Design an enzyme around this catalytic site. Structure first.
Site, mmCIF file in Angstrom:
data_model
loop_
_atom_site.group_PDB
_atom_site.id
_atom_site.type_symbol
_atom_site.label_atom_id
_atom_site.label_comp_id
_atom_site.label_asym_id
_atom_site.label_seq_id
_atom_site.Cartn_x
_atom_site.Cartn_y
_atom_site.Cartn_z
ATOM 1 N N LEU A 192 3.914 -5.089 10.309
ATOM 2 C CA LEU A 192 3.107 -5.258 9.110
ATOM 3 C C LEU A 192 4.026 -5.681 7.956
ATOM 4 O O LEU A 192 4.991 -4.982 7.647
ATOM 5 C CB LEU A 192 2.355 -3.972 8.755
ATOM 6 C CG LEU A 192 1.606 -4.049 7.414
ATOM 7 C CD1 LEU A 192 0.480 -5.084 7.460
ATOM 8 C CD2 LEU A 192 1.098 -2.688 6.930
ATOM 9 N N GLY A 193 3.729 -6.816 7.327
ATOM 10 C CA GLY A 193 4.492 -7.304 6.182
ATOM 11 C C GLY A 193 6.011 -7.236 6.253
ATOM 12 O O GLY A 193 6.627 -7.482 7.294
ATOM 13 N N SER A 211 7.501 -0.275 7.949
ATOM 14 C CA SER A 211 8.611 0.182 8.783
ATOM 15 C C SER A 211 8.216 0.126 10.262
ATOM 16 O O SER A 211 8.163 -0.956 10.853
ATOM 17 C CB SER A 211 9.025 1.600 8.387
ATOM 18 O OG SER A 211 10.329 1.901 8.845
ATOM 19 N N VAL A 243 5.437 0.396 11.246
ATOM 20 C CA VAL A 243 4.052 0.043 11.068
ATOM 21 C C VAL A 243 3.771 -1.346 11.624
ATOM 22 O O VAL A 243 4.514 -2.291 11.356
ATOM 23 C CB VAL A 243 3.697 0.110 9.577
ATOM 24 C CG1 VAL A 243 2.255 -0.163 9.374
ATOM 25 C CG2 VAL A 243 4.043 1.485 9.032
ATOM 26 N N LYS A 273 0.457 3.014 12.663
ATOM 27 C CA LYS A 273 1.700 3.641 12.235
ATOM 28 C C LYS A 273 2.184 4.603 13.321
ATOM 29 O O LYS A 273 1.504 5.564 13.653
ATOM 30 C CB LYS A 273 1.487 4.366 10.902
ATOM 31 C CG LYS A 273 2.636 5.251 10.437
ATOM 32 C CD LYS A 273 2.136 6.174 9.317
ATOM 33 C CE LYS A 273 3.266 6.710 8.484
ATOM 34 N NZ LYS A 273 2.738 7.537 7.362
ATOM 35 N N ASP A 290 4.522 11.499 -3.083
ATOM 36 C CA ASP A 290 5.342 10.292 -2.873
ATOM 37 C C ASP A 290 4.788 9.047 -3.567
ATOM 38 O O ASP A 290 4.843 7.950 -3.003
ATOM 39 C CB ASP A 290 5.541 10.021 -1.363
ATOM 40 C CG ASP A 290 6.837 9.246 -1.064
ATOM 41 O OD1 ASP A 290 7.688 9.091 -1.974
ATOM 42 O OD2 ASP A 290 6.993 8.748 0.071
HETATM 43 O O1 LIG Z 1 -0.267 5.599 5.554
HETATM 44 C C1 LIG Z 1 0.650 4.788 5.834
HETATM 45 O O2 LIG Z 1 1.859 5.072 6.003
HETATM 46 C C2 LIG Z 1 0.259 3.317 5.908
HETATM 47 C C3 LIG Z 1 -1.078 2.933 5.990
HETATM 48 C C4 LIG Z 1 -1.391 1.572 6.037
HETATM 49 C C5 LIG Z 1 -0.355 0.651 5.980
HETATM 50 N N1 LIG Z 1 0.963 0.984 5.893
HETATM 51 C C6 LIG Z 1 1.254 2.324 5.854
#
Ligand SMILES: O=C(O)c1cccnc1
Length: 319
Positions: free
Chosen positions: A40-41, A42, A44, A59, A147
């Site tokens: 996506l675009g 860690s 994740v 995730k 966070d």
């Molecule tokens: O909740 C997360 O860590 C999350 C959710 C969507 C996309 N990226 C991270």
């Protein structure tokens, strides 16, 4: 010590099941229902639900961390349907490794480092207001995010959509409870954290939000740029003032770590207008600075609540 001014008792009105996350038993589906296509675009990934062909975000969690997995899952479930909170679609495990993962709604994000450079005054008011709705919501359900930072605020600028993500550090607020101060990310840590005050509350998220507001309207990102957790407090004191810091510590009977003795120095409180210059003047106004001053203040208990912040004149154009 201290308690929250607004949602102090919400968890006492809940069944133990609601906040006792160590006892929560997630229902783990099969991750084989998901095709993990790209980063996506860690850890994740963009994914496709093989059943209905819907794009989602997966995730991957850290298998050995049992407590925190249960905590994140329970909190996400408690907040489901909350305004501008990322929607948890499913909880699944890879059938071979048994590694747990979370499935989320997909949001097409613009990286904040580029996005913040083109935001107008109106845009900042608009998205801050949207973020406040998420915080007021999760605080009202007895949860602190812990966070808040730009990376955890996903914005789709095309569709004007905002989602507060990564609830992996989030906790339930119980009055007088003592929490871990090693939470949040360095630049967004409240001074209560940096002086090792464990009896903090929802107002921690409001400090972090204030740090975001400051970096957006002043174009100094991050606004308080500490080189370590000690220096982080020094950076804050250079703005809010050192004598003002001591007053805060005295009020709550906090002893300052002796290491600070020779690095803290002496700094008078700065007026927020000091940070205006030609490059940010079109993002700054008296109402922006008045709000900011009521968020970035040492005394966590006197900081505006999310709801009070939403009532501020700074948001009149977006209400
Ligand atoms: O909740 C997360 O860590 C999350 C959710 C969507 C996309 N990226 C991270």
């Amino acid at each position: 010590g201290s308690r929250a001014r607004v949602y102090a008792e919400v968890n006492s009105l809940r069944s133990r099941e609601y906040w006792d996350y160590e006892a929560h038993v997630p229902s783990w589906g099969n991750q084989d229902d998901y095709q993990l296509v790209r980063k996506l675009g860690s850890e994740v990934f963009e994914a496709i639900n093989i059943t209905n062909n819907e794009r989602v975000v997966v995730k991957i969690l850290k298998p050995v961390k049992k407590k925190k997995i249960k905590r994140e899952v329970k909190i996400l479930e408690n907040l489901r349907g909350g305004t501008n909170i990322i929607k948890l679609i499913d909880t699944v495990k890879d059938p071979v490794s048994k590694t747990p993962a979370l499935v989320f709604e997909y949001i097409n994000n613009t990286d904040f480092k580029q996005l913040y450079q083109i935001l107008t005054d109106f845009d900042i008011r608009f998205y801050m207001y949207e973020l406040l709705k998420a915080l007021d919501y999760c605080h009202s359900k007895g949860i602190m995010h812990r966070d808040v930072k730009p990376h955890n605020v996903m914005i789709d600028h095309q569709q004007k959509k905002l989602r507060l993500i990564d609830w992996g550090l989030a906790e339930f607020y119980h009055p007088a409870q003592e929490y871990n101060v090693r939470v949040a990310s360095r630049y967004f840590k409240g001074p209560e954290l940096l002086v090792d005050y464990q009896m903090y509350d929802y107002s921690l998220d409001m400090w972090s939000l204030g740090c975001m507001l400051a970096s957006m309207i002043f174009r100094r990102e991050p606004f308080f740029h500490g080189q370590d957790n000690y220096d982080q407090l020094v950076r804050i004191a250079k703005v809010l003032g050192t004598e003002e810091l001591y007053g805060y510590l005295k009020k709550y009977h906090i002893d300052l770590d002796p290491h600070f003795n020779d690095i803290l120095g002496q700094h008078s409180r700065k007026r927020w207008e000091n940070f205006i210059h030609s490059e940010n003047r079109h993002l700054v106004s008296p109402e922006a600075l008045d709000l900011l001053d009521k968020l970035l203040r040492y005394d966590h208990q006197q900081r505006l609540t999310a709801k009070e912040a939403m009532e501020h004149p700074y948001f009149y154009p977006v209400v």
